[PDB]
Design a protein around this ligand. Sequence first.
Ligand SMILES: Nc1ncnc2c1ncn2[C@@H]1O[C@H](COP(=O)(O)OP(=O)(O)OP(=O)(O)O)[C@@H](O)[C@H]1O
Ligand SMILES: Nc1ncnc2c1ncn2[C@@H]1O[C@H](COP(=O)(O)OP(=O)(O)OP(=O)(O)O)[C@@H](O)[C@H]1O
Ligand SMILES: Nc1ncnc2c1ncn2[C@@H]1O[C@H](COP(=O)(O)OP(=O)(O)OP(=O)(O)O)[C@@H](O)[C@H]1O
Ligand SMILES: Nc1ncnc2c1ncn2[C@@H]1O[C@H](COP(=O)(O)OP(=O)(O)OP(=O)(O)O)[C@@H](O)[C@H]1O
Ligand SMILES: Nc1ncnc2c1ncn2[C@@H]1O[C@H](COP(=O)(O)OP(=O)(O)OP(=O)(O)O)[C@@H](O)[C@H]1O
Lengths: 362, 362, 362, 362, 362
Amino acid sequence: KQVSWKLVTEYAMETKCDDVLLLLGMYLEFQYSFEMCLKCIKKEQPSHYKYHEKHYANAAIFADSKNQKTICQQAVDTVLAKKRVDSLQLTREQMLTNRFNDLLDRMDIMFGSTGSADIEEWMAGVAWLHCLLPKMDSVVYDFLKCMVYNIPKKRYWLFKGPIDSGKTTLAAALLELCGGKALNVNLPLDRLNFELGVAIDQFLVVFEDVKGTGGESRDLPSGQGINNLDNLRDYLDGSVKVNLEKKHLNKRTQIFPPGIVTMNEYSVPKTLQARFVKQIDFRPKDYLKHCLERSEFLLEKRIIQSGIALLLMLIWYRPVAEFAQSIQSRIVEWKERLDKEFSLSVYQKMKFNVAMGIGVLD
Amino acid sequence: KQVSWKLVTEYAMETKCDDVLLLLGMYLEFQYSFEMCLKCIKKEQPSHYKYHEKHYANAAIFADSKNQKTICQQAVDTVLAKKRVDSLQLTREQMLTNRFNDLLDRMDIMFGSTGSADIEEWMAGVAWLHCLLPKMDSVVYDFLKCMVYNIPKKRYWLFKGPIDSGKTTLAAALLELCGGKALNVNLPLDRLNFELGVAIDQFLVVFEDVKGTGGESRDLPSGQGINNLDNLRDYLDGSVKVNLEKKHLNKRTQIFPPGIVTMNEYSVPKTLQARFVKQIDFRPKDYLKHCLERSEFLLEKRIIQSGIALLLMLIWYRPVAEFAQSIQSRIVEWKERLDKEFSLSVYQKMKFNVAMGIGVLD
Amino acid sequence: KQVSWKLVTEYAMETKCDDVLLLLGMYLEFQYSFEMCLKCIKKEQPSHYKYHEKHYANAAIFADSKNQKTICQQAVDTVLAKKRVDSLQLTREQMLTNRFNDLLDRMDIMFGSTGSADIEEWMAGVAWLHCLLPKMDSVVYDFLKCMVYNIPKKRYWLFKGPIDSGKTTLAAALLELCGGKALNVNLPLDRLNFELGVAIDQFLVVFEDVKGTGGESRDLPSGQGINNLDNLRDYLDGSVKVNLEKKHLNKRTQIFPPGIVTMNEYSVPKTLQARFVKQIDFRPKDYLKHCLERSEFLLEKRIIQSGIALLLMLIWYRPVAEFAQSIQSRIVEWKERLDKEFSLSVYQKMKFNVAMGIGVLD
Amino acid sequence: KQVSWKLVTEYAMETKCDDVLLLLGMYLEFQYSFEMCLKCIKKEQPSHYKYHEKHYANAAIFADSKNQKTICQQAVDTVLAKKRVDSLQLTREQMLTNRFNDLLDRMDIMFGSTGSADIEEWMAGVAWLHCLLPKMDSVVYDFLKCMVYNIPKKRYWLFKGPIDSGKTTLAAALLELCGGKALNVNLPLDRLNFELGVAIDQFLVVFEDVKGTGGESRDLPSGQGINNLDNLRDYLDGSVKVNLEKKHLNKRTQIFPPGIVTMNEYSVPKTLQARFVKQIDFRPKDYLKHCLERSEFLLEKRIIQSGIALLLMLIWYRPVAEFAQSIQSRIVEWKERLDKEFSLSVYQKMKFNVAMGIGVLD
Amino acid sequence: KQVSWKLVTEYAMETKCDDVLLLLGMYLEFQYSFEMCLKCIKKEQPSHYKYHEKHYANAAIFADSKNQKTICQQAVDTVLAKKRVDSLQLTREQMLTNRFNDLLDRMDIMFGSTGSADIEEWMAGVAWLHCLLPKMDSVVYDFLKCMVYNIPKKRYWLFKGPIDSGKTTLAAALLELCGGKALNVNLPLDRLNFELGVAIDQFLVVFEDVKGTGGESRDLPSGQGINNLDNLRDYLDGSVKVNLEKKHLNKRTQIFPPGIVTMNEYSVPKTLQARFVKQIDFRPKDYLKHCLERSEFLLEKRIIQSGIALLLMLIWYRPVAEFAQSIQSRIVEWKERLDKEFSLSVYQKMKFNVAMGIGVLD
DNA sequence: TTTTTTTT
Ligand SMILES: Nc1ncnc2c1ncn2[C@@H]1O[C@H](COP(=O)(O)OP(=O)(O)OP(=O)(O)O)[C@@H](O)[C@H]1O
Ligand SMILES: Nc1ncnc2c1ncn2[C@@H]1O[C@H](COP(=O)(O)OP(=O)(O)OP(=O)(O)O)[C@@H](O)[C@H]1O
Ligand SMILES: Nc1ncnc2c1ncn2[C@@H]1O[C@H](COP(=O)(O)OP(=O)(O)OP(=O)(O)O)[C@@H](O)[C@H]1O
Ligand SMILES: Nc1ncnc2c1ncn2[C@@H]1O[C@H](COP(=O)(O)OP(=O)(O)OP(=O)(O)O)[C@@H](O)[C@H]1O
Ligand SMILES: Nc1ncnc2c1ncn2[C@@H]1O[C@H](COP(=O)(O)OP(=O)(O)OP(=O)(O)O)[C@@H](O)[C@H]1O
C-alpha cells in the first residue's frame, strides 16, 4: 500500500499550516495509536486531538516513507498557493470578515468549558481601553473603515505623545485584530531594503517609534526615521504598485499596505504631515497608572495588548448592522452571551473603578 | 489514467498566468464538481467560472499527482516564452493594439450583465480628468504616439509641479493604460542593479518623485534621485542596448523602455534637461478639490487613477480612424453605446458641475 | 536486503543528534562487531555503548548503502521537526522540566560506578556557591520562578559589582542550568541586528558586561552599551513581539527572552533602572580568594561554573514539593542518595572551612 | 513515438538561437498545421516560415513532451559550444567576414521582394552619415583594420566631447557592424568585477560616457567611472588574458576585447591617456540638425544608428579588393545593385541637401 | 550501442581541455564523416585532425545522446583532478620542467610548418633582449634558479632606476614562463591587508614601483610602501608560513612566495635593504628607444615581453646541461634549428643594429 | 552558488 499525499494536503489545509517542519513534526505524532494517545486523552491541542484518529492509518505508512520531506513540501505549497489566490481575489471587506471569523473561533475556545480565560478579566480590559481615549469604540470603527476603503493618500494615522502613553499598546491590539507586521525604519538605508520586504501580502503595517532629529530639545534621542521616511512618501501614498524584496528571492510588485506611525513628540516635515489623514495625541494619566498598579493581572495575561480585547469592545458597543452580513449571526450569539453574563451596572461599576484609580474589580 | 500537461498549459495560456503559485492555486479549485461550484453559481471570477466545467475532469487527476509543481512550472514557462517571442517580433503598435483589446474585454465585464461598474460614475471621472489640463485628450494622443514611435533620445516626458498637483494621478492612469512599471531611483547606487532589472520586456516605465537637490531652500529634502538619473543617460536615450539583472539569473540585454518622470521642483543638471523631449507643469486648483470633496466615490473606487477612465476619454474624444484597424470595430460599438448611455447635455451638466467645484452629480 | 531508515531515525531521536555529519559518523562505527567492540568494552561513550548491539545489523547494511547522506538528512530532519513542535506547544514549566531531566541523566553517569566525578568535590562546590551571596538557594528559586512566569516588565535582573566579584561565574551557571545565550551590546549600533539575532528561540539571554560612560572617573573604560540598552525598551519589558534576524535568513517575530544584565559600577539612568525587577550586588571577599587557592580542584574541574552544581544546591536545599510533579520522584531518589553520602555535620564543616578561608576539605 | 532532440538542435543552430525561452516559444509555434498557418501565408517572419513545414511533425510530438525545457537547454548549449569553438579557432578576419555575411543576408531580405524598406532612404542615410565627418568611409576602414590587427596599447579609440555631438550615434553603428557589446563602469568595483564577465567571447566592446572628474567645473559630475578605467589598464592595452565571470556557471580567462570608450569633457589621468591610438572628439554642425529635423524618417527608422548604413557606405566607397576575399563576389553583386538604382548625381543631390541642412528627398 | 564515456575522457586528457563548453563543441565536430572531413583536409587544427578518425564512431552516437553535458562534465573533472594531484605532489623543479616543455611546444607552434611568425623576427627580439643590459642570459639564469630554490631570505632582488627603464617590461615577461603576479604597497594599511592577501598560490611574485614615503625629499610622490615593507619582515624572508586574506573570504596559510621589488631611485632603510640579495638599477637608453622605434614588429607580434623570446635567449646562450635533464633533448633539437638557420654574423649584425639603436632586421 | 554578508 502507499501514502496518500491527498490526506496530508488535507491536514495542512485544515490546520492552515505553512511551515514544512511544523507540518512534518505534527503529522509524525499520529503514527502511534490514537487510542492511547495521551495528547488526545488530555485534550491538550485541538490541531492534534481532532485529527489523530482520522489520519492515523496514513501516518503509519508515512512513517515508513523514504520521501517524507518531498510529501510535506507539496502540502505546504498548497497552503501557500491558497493565500496567493485569496490575496488577488477577495475584497478587503471579505478578508476582514475571514480574519474576524478566526478570532471568534479562538474566542470560542478561550471562553469554552476547556476555556481557561476568565471573561470577567477580559471584560475588565475593555473598560481600561475605553478610558484610554475619548469615544474609543468610535475611533476603532473609523480606523477599520479606513483600512477597508484603503483610499490613496488618505491611508495613514499618526500616533504621538510622551513616553508611556499607550500608543504601542494600542497599535499592538489593532495589529493583532487586523493582522499585519511591525517595521523599524530607524536604520541604515541598505538594510532598509530587506526590512520593507516583510510587508508582502500583509494587511496592515505599523512603523514603530520613528526617530526625528533635534528632538534633544525635548531630550529625545535623535535618529534616522523621519528623514528616512520622507524618502518613502510613495509607499505611504499607495497610489501605485511598488517592488518588494526578500533574501535569496526575486521581487514582487504590489501596493504597499495602509497602517500606523508611532512617534515621540518630534516635529515633522509637512511633506509628510500632509500624508497623515489623522493624528491622535496620547497623554499620560495618573488614574490609569494607579488603577493599573492595582489590576496587574491585566498586564500579566497581556489582556491590554490583545486583539481579542478590541473585538470584545466592538461587540459590546457597536450595532449588529455594522458587521458584514455573514458574521452577524455569530455576532448576535456573542452579544447575547455577553449580556447574559454582564449587567450594564457591572460594566459601569468597572469604568467607575478605573476613573477612581482603584483596582478595576470590587 | 494520467494528467494532461497539455490541458494545464492551455489554461495558463488562456488566463495569461505568470505565477506558478497562482496557477497552482486556481487549477486546484477545479477539482470539486462544477455542478455545484458556488463560485460558478455566484459568477464571481471570470477566470474561474468560464473554465471550471472544461478543466474539471483533468483537475481531478491533477489533484492526486505527485509532480504538481513541475507540471505548473512547465505551464508558466510556456506563458513566459510567449511573452519573449512577442516582445521580439511584434511592432510596438501591435503590442498596444493587443493591450487595448484586454482592457476592452475588462470593460465588457465591468459594464456587462454582472455590471458592477456604474458607467455614469466612470464617465464623471472622464470629465474630471479632461478638466485637469487644457486639451487633455490631445495630450494623451501625443504621448501614445511618442511611446509607439520610440524615437531615440526623444523618449521621456517630465512632470513638474508642487504636491497634490495631480501629476502622480495622471501618471498612474497612463501606466495602467500602457502596462509599464514604476521604479524608485532615490535608493543607493548599488541595488539599482536588481531594481532596474524589473524593466525587462516592459513597454513603459515611470520614475517617481525623483529626489534632487537645491529644493532644500523650499523644504524638498534631497537625495540620490537626480544624481542617479544623470548617471543613466544612456538608459534614457535608448540609443543602445543595456544589460539587465535578476537574482539567480544571468543578464538579459535589451533597449530600455521609454516613459515618464515626476518631480517636485528640485534642480536639474541640463544633461538631463536635454533628454526630456517634453515637460508638463501642473498646478493645484481648489475647485477640483471642492469637487472631489463631495464626489468622494471617485477616489474610493480609484476611478480617476485608472487607464480604463483614459480609454473612455479617448473613445469619447477621438476619431475612429486614429485607432488601429482591427479594433476600429470594437471602438465603433463603444462609441454607439456611449451615445446611447449619455446625452451631450448630461456630459455638459457633469463638466459644468466639475467647473463649479460642486459635486459632479445633481 | 534493505536498510531500515526507521532504525536510524530512532537512533537520531534517542541521541537527539542534531548534526548530519555527527549522526553519520557515529552510526558507521556500529558496523564492526559490538561483541568485540573496544569502545563498548571500555564503556567510553554512552551514545555508543548503549546502542551498538541494537543497531549492529542495520549498520552493516547501511555501510553498503549508496544513499548514505540521504538517509541521514531525513533522520536529522525528524529531530529538528520535533524541536519546533515542542517550541510552539510546551509550557515554559514543561520546558524547564525537560531541561532538568537532561541534567539528572548526566549526573547519573557522572556519579555512577563508571562515573569519573567525585560527589564530595561537587558538594564542596555547592558549599562555596552558597557562600557567594546571602540566601543563595532562595535567590535561585526566585530567579527560576521569574523566568518561568515571564511576566511583562518583571523580567530582568541586574548583577552589579567590581571585577573578579563572581558575577560572570553565577551567570554562566544559571545559563547552563536553563540554556540560553550570551550577547554583547557594547557593539556599534549598526551591528546589533545580527547580534540580537542570536536570541532566536532561546530560553534565557545574558548581556555581558555592558559598558557605561563617564565611569572613567572611576577608571571604568567607557562604551556604548548602556545607551544601546536604553534604546531597547520593548525587548526588555517583553510586552509585545519583536522581529529578529539571522545571516542569510528571513526575519522571525517573537517575544524577546528574559535574562540578566551584568556590569561593573557604572552609573545607570533611571529609565533603565525601572526596567529591572531586582538588583544584586556582588562584592569581592578575601576568604573566598584564599579558600580558592587551597581548593583549586574546584577551578580545575570547572565545578563552580556548572549548572550541575546549582542543581545539586537546589536538591539539597529545596522542599520536594517545589519541583514539577513528574520529576519529584527522581528528586526524592537523589535527596536520599545525598542524605546517605553526607551527614549534615560533614556539610556544615565544609561551610565553616570556607568561612575560615581555609581549604574546604579536612 | 518520441521527440527528435536532433531536429530541435538543428533549428537552434540554423536560427543561431541563443536563449532557452526564445527557442521554446519559437518551436511551439510549429505544432499547428503549417498548411494553413497564417504566419506562413503572411511570410511574416523568416525564422518561422522557412521552417514550419519541415519541423511540423517533430513539433507535434514535442508539444506533448514532459521534458520540454531540458530539450531546449541541450540545444542552446550546442549553439554556445559552437560559438566558443569559433571563438578560439578563427582569425579575427575570418570572424569579421562571417559577420558581414549575416548583415548581407538581412539586406537581401530588407530590400528584397518583401522589401519592407527602400534603399533610397537608407542611401540618403548613407549620405547624411558620410557628411558627419570627412571621408567617413576611410576613417571607418582604419577602425576596422585596427580592430582586426588588435595591436596592444595601440588598441582603443576615445570619443571625448560634448553632448549631441553624435559620438554615441557613431559608436552604435560601429558596434552593430562589429557585433560587440556595450559595457558600463560607472559603478561599484564589487559589481564591476562581475559585470565585465559579459566580455566573454566578444569581438569588440564600447564603454559609454564614463564619469570622469574635473568636469564638475563644467557641471559634469565626477564619479567612479574613470577610477575604474585608469585601474584596469591591462584590459585596455590587451596586455594579457584575465578572468571573466558568470552565474551558476564556470568562469573563464581570456584576453579582453579591444574597444572604444566615450565621455564628455572630464579630465583624464595621463596614465590612462597613454593607452589610445586615437583620441578624438566630436562637435555639432547645426545644418545637419535642420536637415534631420526635416528628414525625420531617417531617425524614426533608426537608419543613422544602424550598422547596415555603414555597410552600405563601405559598399559604395571602398574598392572590392579592400574586402576579405571570399565575400568579394557578394560585394560586386551589391555594388551593381547600387549603381543599378542610383546615379552619382542622385547621391550628390542628397549630399548637397544634407550639407545645405534641408529635407533630402526632393 | 552506446556512447563510450571512456573515449571522451581520453580526448579531454589528451587535449587537456578544462572547459565543458569547449569539450562539447569540439567533440561534436567529429560526428560528420571523417572519411571526407574538410577540416582534416585543410590540416587547420591538430586538436581536430589528429583525433577525428579515431573518435568518429563514438562521436556519431554522442550526437544522438540525450545526456551530452553530463558526459562532458565528468570528463572535465578528470582533467581538473589530474592538475590538483600534480599541483600537490610535484617539486618546483618538476613544475618548471613541465612549464618549459609547454613553451617549447609553443615554439613548435610558433615556428611549425605554418611558420606563422618568423623565427628570425623572433631572433630580432632575442637580439633586443640580450642587448638590453649586462650579460642578460646569465642574469636570467641566476634569477631563475634563485626562484626555483626559494631559499629563505635569499629571495628578493631590487630593481631601482627611473621610469621607462624597462624594469616593469622585463619582470612581466618572466611570468609567461612561470606564472605569478605583481602587487601594490603604496597604500594605507587597511588596503595593504587585502593587497598582501592577493598573493596566494603564486609561483613567483613582483611589486609595483615603491612610491617610497621618506623618499619624497628626492622630489618624488609617495605611498606608505617603505614603512610597509620594512615592517613586513617575514614575508620577504619566507622563513615561516604566513596568513593571507581576501574580500568576503577566509584566511589561507602558506610561505610567502619569492619575487622582485621595483622602484625609482627612492630612499631605503638599511633594514629594508637587508631584505634583498641584489641591488639593480635600470635606465632608459638612447639606442634602445630608437631601436624599438625602428623595430616595432617586435612589439607588433608581442615578442619583447613574450616568454618565448626569453626561452630562445636561453636556448641560444645556455648550454644543454643547464636545462632540465630530459628536456635537454628538445634543447639540442632547437639548438640544431637556431644554429643552422642563423649565422652568428646575422645574430651579431642584429645585436650590432641594436647597439647602433637602428632597425634590427637590416 | 548565488546570495547575503562583507566591505565600506
Ligand atoms: N496613558 C497612560 N497613562 C499612564 N500610564 C500609561 C498610559 N499608557 C500606558 N501606560 C503605562 O505605560 C506602559 C507602557 O505602555 P506603552 O508601551 O504602550 O507605551 P508607549 O508610550 O506607547 O511606548 P513606546 O513609545 O515605547 O511605544 C503601560 O504598560 C502602562 O503601564
Ligand atoms: N490639480 C489639482 N488641484 C487640486 N487638487 C489636486 C490636483 N491634483 C491632485 N489633487 C489632489 O491631490 C491628490 C494627490 O494627487 P497627486 O498624487 O496626483 O499629486 P502629485 O503632485 O503627483 O503629488 P506628490 O508629489 O505628493 O506625489 C489627489 O488625490 C487629489 O485629491
Ligand atoms: N566574591 C568573590 N570574591 C573574591 N574573588 C572572587 C569572587 N567571585 C569571583 N572571584 C574570583 O574572580 C574570578 C573571576 O570571576 P568572575 O568572572 O565571575 O567575576 P566577575 O566579577 O563577574 O568579572 P567580570 O565582570 O570581569 O567577568 C573567579 O575565578 C575567582 O577567582
Ligand atoms: N552635426 C550635428 N549638428 C547638430 N546635432 C547633431 C549633430 N551630430 C549629431 N547631433 C545630434 O546628436 C544627437 C545625439 O547624438 P549622440 O547621442 O550620438 O551624441 P553624443 O555626443 O554621444 O551625446 P551624449 O554625450 O549625450 O551621449 C543626435 O540626435 C543628433 O541629432
Ligand atoms: N631601457 C630602455 N630604454 C628605452 N626604452 C625602454 C627601455 N626599457 C623599456 N623601454 C620601453 O619603454 C616601455 C616602458 O618600460 P617600463 O614600463 O618597463 O619601464 P619602468 O622603468 O618599469 O617604468 P615606470 O617606473 O615608469 O613604471 C617598455 O614597454 C618599452 O617599450
